[PDB]
Design a binder for these strands. Structure first.
Ligand SMILES: [Mg+2]
Ligand SMILES: [Mg+2]
Ligand SMILES: [Mg+2]
Ligand SMILES: [Mg+2]
Ligand SMILES: [Mg+2]
Ligand SMILES: [Mg+2]
Ligand SMILES: [Mg+2]
Ligand SMILES: [Mg+2]
Ligand SMILES: [Mg+2]
Ligand SMILES: [Mg+2]
Ligand SMILES: [Mg+2]
Ligand SMILES: [Mg+2]
Ligand SMILES: [Mg+2]
Ligand SMILES: [Mg+2]
Ligand SMILES: [Mg+2]
Ligand SMILES: [Mg+2]
Ligand SMILES: [Mg+2]
Ligand SMILES: [Mg+2]
Ligand SMILES: [Mg+2]
Ligand SMILES: [Mg+2]
Ligand SMILES: [Mg+2]
Ligand SMILES: [Mg+2]
Ligand SMILES: [Mg+2]
Ligand SMILES: [Mg+2]
Ligand SMILES: [Mg+2]
Ligand SMILES: [Mg+2]
Ligand SMILES: [Mg+2]
Ligand SMILES: [Mg+2]
Ligand SMILES: [Mg+2]
Ligand SMILES: [Mg+2]
Ligand SMILES: [Mg+2]
Ligand SMILES: [Mg+2]
Ligand SMILES: [Mg+2]
Ligand SMILES: [Mg+2]
Ligand SMILES: [Mg+2]
Ligand SMILES: [Mg+2]
Ligand SMILES: [Mg+2]
Ligand SMILES: [Mg+2]
Ligand SMILES: [Mg+2]
Ligand SMILES: [Mg+2]
Ligand SMILES: [Mg+2]
Ligand SMILES: [Mg+2]
Ligand SMILES: [Mg+2]
Ligand SMILES: [Zn+2]
Lengths: 119, 50, 85, 60, 101
RNA sequence: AAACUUUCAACAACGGAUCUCUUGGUUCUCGCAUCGAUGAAGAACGCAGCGAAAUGCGAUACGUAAUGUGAAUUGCAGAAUUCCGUGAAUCAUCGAAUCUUUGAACGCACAUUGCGCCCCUUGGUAUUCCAGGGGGCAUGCCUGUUUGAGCGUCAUUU
RNA sequence: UUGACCUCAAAUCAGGUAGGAGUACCCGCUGAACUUAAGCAUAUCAAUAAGCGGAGGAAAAGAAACCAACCGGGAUUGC
RNA sequence: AUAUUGGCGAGAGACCGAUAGCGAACAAGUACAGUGAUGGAAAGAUGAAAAGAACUUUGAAAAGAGAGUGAAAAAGUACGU
RNA sequence: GUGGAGGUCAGUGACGAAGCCUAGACCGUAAGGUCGGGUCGAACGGCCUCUAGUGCAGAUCUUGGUGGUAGUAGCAAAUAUUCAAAUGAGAACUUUGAAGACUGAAGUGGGGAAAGGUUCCACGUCAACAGCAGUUGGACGUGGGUUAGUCGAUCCUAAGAGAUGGGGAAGCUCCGUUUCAAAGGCCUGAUUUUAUGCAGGCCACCAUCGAAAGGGAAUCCGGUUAAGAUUCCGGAACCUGGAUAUGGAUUCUUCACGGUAACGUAACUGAAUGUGGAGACGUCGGCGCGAGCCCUGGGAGGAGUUAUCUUUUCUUCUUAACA
RNA sequence: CUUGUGACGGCCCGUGAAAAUCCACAGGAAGGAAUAGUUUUCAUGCCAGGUCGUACUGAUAACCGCAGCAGGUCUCCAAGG
């Protein structure tokens, strides 16, 4: 059982918030009934449903922030790339490709020609 | 030490939970090689040294 | 009576738990751990202690974050998500 | 009597009980059980009955 | 051979002086404008025994000429100085017992 | 003559040798370059219906989201619509997240679950007191902004 | 009086950046002794072990203030 | 072009075969000792499948004697030989 | 003769390979080889060559296991146990009753600090431990239990430790704790576009850590649990911090009066700054005073002895913090 | 008898901690009344007081002496003859 992720994504934040506070309610009363019956595996689906809603709530919030910071430098660090420490510090392909005027003229004038040795 | 720090009392709780025999349903799983709780401790023979 | 009678007077922990390694080797008076070198920034380690390095080297723990870096590298550190092929 | 998260203090416990159960709290006593959990002793005002609240929660 | 005793004192592990009960460093009043141009007056308040010192201390109270405070000095008591005695320190002080000419 | 000792054989003991297996190790060869202040390695404590350990994970806690596969898991119970399907699985993959207290560890400390300060907000008849929620306050150094200090020093005055 | 310059500070000032781990290989510093010499001090073990600082998938070196003495060769690296 | 007892991914051996081979084929850097730096094990094999002995009887009970499963209880969780 | 490798005997083998036992047999001088018989259940051999971690009685050899000694040495300090009943299959050791004893208040009592860590208490339970025993347990299995504005920590500083500014050291790090520092907040008022910069003024230690016996704000009594209490319940208090309203006080001589005086009261403005006090203190001897305990009279209740005597012997009659 | 306390006396070439914290005084900046003020060291009146330890032994058995070892381990209360 439990709530599925895809149909939650069609909701809004207030509906999700109402869903969450409702979800936390039964987990309370399932927990008090857990000590009554010898076993109750139904609580597992309840807790997972809370996680699914919480992920959905977070997912919507970040995307709206991403749209807010779209198209301008200095985005929040957690929304940046998490490749490595080294790669983030590495030279970008633009700056690595930069070359002085003296060398650019030599490359354009004298590139490595394609030659064949048969005759 | 009746008057003890919370850190020591936190190590207290885990030791209480550790000291418990093997659950019986562990015996019945397929390819079960565990015979008993080998890491059992008792206050008379082994001290925690914490 | 340096033997049994003297052994009875041992009730003062010279060391306690280390905040960094949790070994019960933190010297209370010296305020320095004798195992991991806390509070010094560098972790205590010696090349003559070949066994000692092996006990606390990387791999003996969880690699809470470094487990997946090889998996991430194999995919070339892709970004985004799948597309329901 | 309630089991409470070890990060909660008496202010939060008093705040929460009157929230979920809409019942005023006289005083709160807390202790750490030997198993590592926190146990809260919440005393309700004489205007309210603990037994009536207890089975309303679902245990008695 | 083993390090002999007189060497071992220099490290100052247990050979430092026991200074718990001393009332303070017995120094004269600092040399300022008043003393090198005139004289200043003081009052002997306490004649205290100093721990580890045979001579007694004289505890003289002075007035700060620049701020309204009551700078208190610790002298080494000379034979014949009594409590409540006025003490004169400075270049123009009269030659009397306890003065700091 | 019996008992007893000793020798031998059968059976039975003690003990675990030999024989036969081997998800292990060792050695050699080939390919790749990927840790961390966007918080590493390591530590502590916790999380399952029934778990002590190993493994997994972090109050979203043997896990959530996404994709692929296509009907399970299993010791028991339970759950079934999940079965011609946006769909079982302790499945595989893995790009989105969560990630307790720590730790280079960064408000100050730490043998304490100690003590602070700033902003927004809520309640307590409150800018000052108290409490709750959220976000912050390390060191060195670089570039740039702002405010400055120095008869170090110029010009400009009256 | 006003405005510059130079030097030096302060900002929870706008951006960054360094610290730790691993260390088989790599770049340096520091640095022994056992042992051999049928003893032993120079020597040898050894410009090694331990210790300390610093990177990458390689590092380092690298295009002669070179080798040569020949009819001269021609960065570095390795067999 | 060179190095690499580390890390990741692979292929092999006139290598070793549970007192061997890594200390560790197993909940091994674990249990355990030391105040501490550190030191540091032992421990693999029922059976094809638990089919792990229903039931009767003696005993307070553990168990024994029967009965039974099994190709084999001269395989009975102290289990290959 | 052994482990492994190349080649061959289209070698042996679940109709039983290897291994193990066999005063059963055969061959070789021997190292050894072959067969029969019992157990056994999955691989192994003959020959030509190759290769080695290849042959054990010793090494006070290593690891593991087992003997004689041997049912032996022995289980003898701490004065001491006995009868009956109950549970129980089983009682010298368990429970209860009775009896005899001991510790004898610098205890075998009642609590604590360091340490231990659930040993505390309950239920069931005796396979191993309690060097006999065991129905018992500090054992085994399953659970319960630790409540604080006033008790401690947290706060302060002591001997001491230890950053920063600095200066050494190749470096890990060392020295130093106010030192060759541009080392900050304190309060009042203005502004009510408005939040707080300008108005001012003020001050000079200049991190931090360091005591569960040093210093320190404030709680007592009664009752309750299987196990908690100065923490829980009832009652009665106190301290700190903060918002305040009333009453009281004082004022037209604006910030009170009285007493000669020591001084008294219900209050009875007071910033910067300075001074003082408390915190804050050795040891011994005797003396005075207080509290508790001990002794004892009268009386008010209860119990014991009573062949005889004993207005007798023992016991209850208590009053916290705070005002 | 134990203990607290007061006033004393003896002893020293020994004269027998510091800090946090609280109060008072000196001071007179400032603010203050009459148709109304001033006053929160007087009384009453309201609210809050977080966090962590709290069980038990403390020893011829709960600590260290490999152990249920005649050993060692700081302290409080102490009836009658
Ligand atoms: Mg001692
Ligand atoms: Mg010490
Ligand atoms: Mg508490
Ligand atoms: Mg020699
Ligand atoms: Mg020689
Ligand atoms: Mg020699
Ligand atoms: Mg080295
Ligand atoms: Mg290079
Ligand atoms: Mg170069
Ligand atoms: Mg020991
Ligand atoms: Mg057989
Ligand atoms: Mg068999
Ligand atoms: Mg024989
Ligand atoms: Mg056979
Ligand atoms: Mg088989
Ligand atoms: Mg050999
Ligand atoms: Mg032999
Ligand atoms: Mg021999
Ligand atoms: Mg031998
Ligand atoms: Mg005998
Ligand atoms: Mg004897
Ligand atoms: Mg006494
Ligand atoms: Mg008990
Ligand atoms: Mg026995
Ligand atoms: Mg027995
Ligand atoms: Mg230092
Ligand atoms: Mg402190
Ligand atoms: Mg204290
Ligand atoms: Mg004192
Ligand atoms: Mg009191
Ligand atoms: Mg008690
Ligand atoms: Mg009460
Ligand atoms: Mg009056
Ligand atoms: Mg004083
Ligand atoms: Mg009274
Ligand atoms: Mg006394
Ligand atoms: Mg005296
Ligand atoms: Mg208690
Ligand atoms: Mg208690
Ligand atoms: Mg007790
Ligand atoms: Mg005691
Ligand atoms: Mg005692
Ligand atoms: Mg012990
Ligand atoms: Zn450590």
């Amino acid at each position: 059982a439990g709530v599925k992720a895809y149909e939650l994504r069609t909701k809004s934040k207030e509906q999700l918030a109402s869903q969450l506070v409702d979800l936390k309610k039964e987990l309370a009363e399932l927990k008090v009934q857990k000590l009554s019956r010898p076993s109750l595996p139904k609580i597992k689906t309840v807790r997972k449903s809370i996680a699914c809603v919480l992920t959905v709530i977070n997912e919507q919030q970040r995307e709206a922030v991403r749209q807010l910071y779209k198209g301008k430098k200095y985005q929040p660090k957690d929304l940046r790339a998490k490749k490595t420490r080294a790669l983030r510090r590495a030279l970008t392909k633009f700056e690595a490709s930069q070359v002085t005027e003296k060398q650019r003229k030599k490359q354009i004038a004298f590139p490595q020609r394609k030659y064949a040795i048969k005759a | 030490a009746a008057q003890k720090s919370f850190r020591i009392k936190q190590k207290m709780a885990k030791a209480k939970k550790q000291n418990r025999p093997l659950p019986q349903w562990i015996r019945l799983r397929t390819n079960n090689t565990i015979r008993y709780n080998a890491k059992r401790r008792n206050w008379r023979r082994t001290k925690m040294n914490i | 009576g340096k033997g049994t009678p003297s052994f009875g007077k041992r009730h003062n922990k010279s060391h306690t738990l280390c905040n960094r390694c949790g070994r019960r080797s933190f010297h209370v008076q010296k305020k320095t751990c004798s195992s991991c070198g806390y509070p010094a920034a560098k972790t205590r380690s010696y090349n003559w202690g070949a066994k000692a390095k092996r006990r606390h080297t990387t791999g003996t723990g969880r690699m809470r974050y470094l487990k997946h870096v090889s998996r991430r590298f194999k995919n070339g550190f892709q970004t985004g998500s799948a597309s329901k092929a | 009597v309630f089991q409470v998260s070890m990060k909660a203090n008496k202010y939060q416990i008093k705040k929460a009980v009157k929230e979920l159960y809409e019942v005023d709290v006289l005083k709160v006593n807390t202790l750490v059980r030997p198993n590592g959990t926190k146990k809260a002793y919440v005393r309700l005002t004489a205007d309210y009955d603990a037994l009536d609240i207890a089975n309303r929660i679902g245990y008695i | 051979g083993r390090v002999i005793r007189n060497q071992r004192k220099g490290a100052g592990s247990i050979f430092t002086s026991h200074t718990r009960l001393r009332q303070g460093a017995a120094k004269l009043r600092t040399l300022d404008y008043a003393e090198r141009h005139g004289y200043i007056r003081g009052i002997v308040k306490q004649i205290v025994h100093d721990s580890g010192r045979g001579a007694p201390l004289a505890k003289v109270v002075f007035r700060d000429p620049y701020k309204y405070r009551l700078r208190e000095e610790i002298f080494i008591a000379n034979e014949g100085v009594h409590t409540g005695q006025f003490i004169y320190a400075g270049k123009k002080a009269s030659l009397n017992v306890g003065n700091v000419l």
